[PDB]
Amino acid sequence: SGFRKMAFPSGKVEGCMVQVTCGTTTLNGLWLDDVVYCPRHVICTSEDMLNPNYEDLLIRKSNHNFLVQAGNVQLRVIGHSMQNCVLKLKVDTANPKTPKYKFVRIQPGQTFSVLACYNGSPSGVYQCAMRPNFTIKGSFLNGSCGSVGFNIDYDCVSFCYMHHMELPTGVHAGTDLEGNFYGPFVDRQTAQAAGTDTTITVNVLAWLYAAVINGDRWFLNRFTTTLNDFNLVAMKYNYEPLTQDHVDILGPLSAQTGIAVLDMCASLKELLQNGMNGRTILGSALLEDEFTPFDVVRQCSGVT
Amino acid sequence: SGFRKMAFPSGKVEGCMVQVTCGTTTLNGLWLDDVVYCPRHVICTSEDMLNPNYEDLLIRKSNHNFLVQAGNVQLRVIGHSMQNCVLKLKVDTANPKTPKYKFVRIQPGQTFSVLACYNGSPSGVYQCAMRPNFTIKGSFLNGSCGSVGFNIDYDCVSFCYMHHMELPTGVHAGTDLEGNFYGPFVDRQTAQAAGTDTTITVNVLAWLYAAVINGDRWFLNRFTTTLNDFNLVAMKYNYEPLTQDHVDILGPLSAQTGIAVLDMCASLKELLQNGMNGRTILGSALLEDEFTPFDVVRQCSGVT
């Protein structure tokens, strides 16, 4: 029993983190096979970041200008290339700790673990969601760029995020491991405002199921609703529209608890309209949206 | 910027987790040097757990009855002994992945990371606090016993918790790595009720400092208070008394922010008396108490 915001065990990723230095800029790289992946802005000064021309900046860089350190041992850079917003540094040694891995581009509402790193050294692990506005709400200080987000399925790490930038609102933006930003963000120090941070409705419902499984049941009511009726309320409260695909994804939790998805929607509707009245659900005073239906099943079933 | 509930990177601990089986009971063990540490209730059936005599049960057990598996490789048990509520299984092989480590017995209010495991395999990592009633609010299913709690200082793991039991209220109890329960709990399936789960005041204040550092400042008011005045309010709200030792520990956060500790206490006092009025602090609708002053400095400074 109990339900926690749980990250994946970080060891397989810790084994991949390196330090990348270009001139006076140090950040983190991801060492998989004989390639080190890092944000391309490693080549920028803070001055450069106001209006950088990455192709032009990169012309002035040679393999030997990229200092790659794995623990206290230096890696030999034998090639470099830019792919979108990441650099790929080819090194002469395959990472002996390379796990089974994939690169995946996640959808908004999907959760992942972040291994926050500085100077190639892990500092902490926490759980994030890709927000519907394609920001994440992370914990990243200067030096944390190149820290990565991942999921694990048994022994395969799926890398989905690399940390690039903080917006003036203190929310975070980054790329997949092909170097494509999530959302409209760019690796430039300019006016980039996030859109509406809507609530991930399917995740709230999952978490309400988690609450029922773990004994928090006070919010269950006598009502039901329809997708269209629920969605009128969702819209009013800046919740994502609930689709039949979302209903289908909650089916296993519905089956386990015997609470019809539309009945849980009617519980959520009353919580949106009435608030918590000073009560808590799974130790939270607000409706938590950074657990996916898959997360809730995983944690409630003890998957390793 | 940003402030997250962050666990320590779990890799050093993942490298220590094994499976222990005695008869039909499987749980987790901690493999450090040539000793595997696990809950003594590994020797119990569910029937035994109602009124177990561990010394009597252990007489019927030999080294070969303790099946210890590290990944898919079996360890040879060459000795066993009971220390308080843990068994120490001596194996013929030192764990080659043994990190620098210590065993520490933490005080209530101290935080730590839990690596939740099943069958010796890591499933997730999350941050806990030792509650003032010596319970923790974890996420543990059957098979999770022997999962451990730890802190890391650079390259030294300090192990502070081993998971033993869930109370009927769905809160958790366990031991330090000398096998001594935190609080009054016993490894028996009996009536064990937790006392008052008071709020860890020094941790709330730390987190309010974290909020100020990270731009959440709406709750700062024009007031101050005294320890005695604050403590009258703390008592009324089931907060731990604030001591001068706590004030001293918040000194660095006070210095960094320029907000006198007693001024932050007066902010907390108004939040206790007035509530949040539907506002949030660092994404929370309640006052968070599972960050220590050390946690806040660590996360706000990027310690690795």
Ligand SMILES: N#Cc1ccc(N2CCCOCC2)cn1
């Ligand atoms: N947000 C953001 C941000 C700010 C500065 C920055 N630069 C390159 C990497 C670090 O070196 C200093 C300049 C990158 N990203």
Ligand SMILES: N#Cc1ccc(N2CCCOCC2)cn1
């Ligand atoms: N809370 C609790 C609890 C419940 C059962 C239990 N036993 C020994 C280990 C697992 O085997 C089944 C019996 C131990 N702890």
